Amino acid sequence: LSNKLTLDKLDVKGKRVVMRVDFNVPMKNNQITNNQRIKAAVPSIKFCLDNGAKSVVLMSHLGRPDGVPMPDKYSLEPVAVELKSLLGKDVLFLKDCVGPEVEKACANPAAGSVILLENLRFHVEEEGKGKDASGNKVKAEPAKIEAFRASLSKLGDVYVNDAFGTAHRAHSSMVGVNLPQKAGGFLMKKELNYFAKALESPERPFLAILGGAKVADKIQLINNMLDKVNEMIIGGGMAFTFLKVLNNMEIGTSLFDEEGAKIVKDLMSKAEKNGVKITLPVDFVTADKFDENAKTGQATVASGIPAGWMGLDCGPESSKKYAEAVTRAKQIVWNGPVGVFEWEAFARGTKALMDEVVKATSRGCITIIGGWNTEDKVSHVSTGGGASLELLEGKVLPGVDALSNI
């Protein structure tokens, strides 16, 4: 899937390099709470510098500021401070990504310079559509989109896309850069290679672990995975839709997806025609409200969840059945959490499961994780949850397609 130009074939010596990266990291009080997407870009960045690049200009979005500049909430500045630590190299942060000032700054920087621009999405022209201060839904003008693209195009001599997390987005910085050479990066290459081998020639038994809040937005994924896997865990909030429909479990005020409820039968029938074993949870950590300090409880399918209470984690029997499926696997692809792991009271199911998967990695299992302390404890932690969900659904990655051929 990378019959295209890649960085390892790119002479960057004395070249300015504009690189699209995905530096859209989780944040709390403008404090980065996970730097994995940034660490992930370091190998492409270093190769350019090591190979005598004049400069490396990094460009990413952060969050969804919808085409309005929001420095107070969605600035990449924290990332520039984080990058400098992981690189051992000073990082010039620019408070914009286009226009005369940015263009001067990038025109001919000191050699070995590393520039990080401000959030791309502060301009309506990155996405091609924005919003304003009520619902005010804005359309981007074609001539402004071209001027935006032409301005990014000025900031390097060659272009690199290492933004695997964003590969599913057909945005200006993903598809619009007009440079003769547009190469895929080492991340974009590694991500595509782990998924392509997983999907094209899997080790078996092949286990998919799928979690998430609702069913209806995962049909095509589940559908597609059922054609490939030997086993599948359906975990998290979506499990309650399956359990209501299949077991008439009383689920309290748990998540119930009404659309997906209507096709659960079609999913189980496909699974069964394919000989795929579905593992669903059989017990729960419940809570009197969607809250980190909710009073906790416990339930099984047999007991039901009391009224006013909702399941936010699976219970120890469920973790045990999960572990049994993980033990059988020679290959595991895990996307979506199986409880509200953000909250400690509702983390034990996700942590228990991660321990098994980690342990699986040590006996030689292929473990692909999506999106604590993993990263070296599994085969592949992926930087693109949302991007990789579209890979698995067989969909088009504009960010990969817009790359130069061979």
Curated annotation (Swiss-Prot):
N6-acetyllysine PTM sites in chain numbering: 9, 46, 73, 84, 89, 95, 129, 144, 197, 265, 289, 359
UniProt organism field: Homo sapiens (Human)
GO biological process: canonical glycolysis; cellular response to hypoxia; epithelial cell differentiation; gluconeogenesis; glycolytic process; negative regulation of acetyl-CoA biosynthetic process from pyruvate; negative regulation of angiogenesis; plasminogen activation
This protein's name: Phosphoglycerate kinase 1
Residues with the N6-malonyllysine modification: 129
Catalysed reaction equations from the record: (2R)-3-phosphoglycerate + ATP = (2R)-3-phospho-glyceroyl phosphate + ADP; L-seryl-[protein] + ATP = O-phospho-L-seryl-[protein] + ADP + H(+)
Alphabetical list of Pfam families matching this protein: PGK
Outcome recorded upon mutating residue 283 to V: In PGK1D; with chronic hemolytic anemia; variant Herlev; 50% of activity
Note: Dysregulated mitochondrial targeting of PGK1 may contribute to the elevation of aerobic glycolysis seen in tumor cells, a phenomenon known as the Warburg effect.
Region Mitochondrial targeting region exposed following cis-trans isomerization by PIN1 and recognized by the TOM complex for mitochondrial translocation of the protein, annotated ranges: 36-41
Binding-site list for AMP: 213-214, 218, 237, 311, 342
Residues given in the record as (2R)-3-phosphoglycerate binding sites: 21-24, 36-37, 60-61, 63-64, 120-121, 168-169
PANTHER family: PHOSPHOGLYCERATE KINASE (PTHR11406), PHOSPHOGLYCERATE KINASE 1 (PTHR11406:SF14)
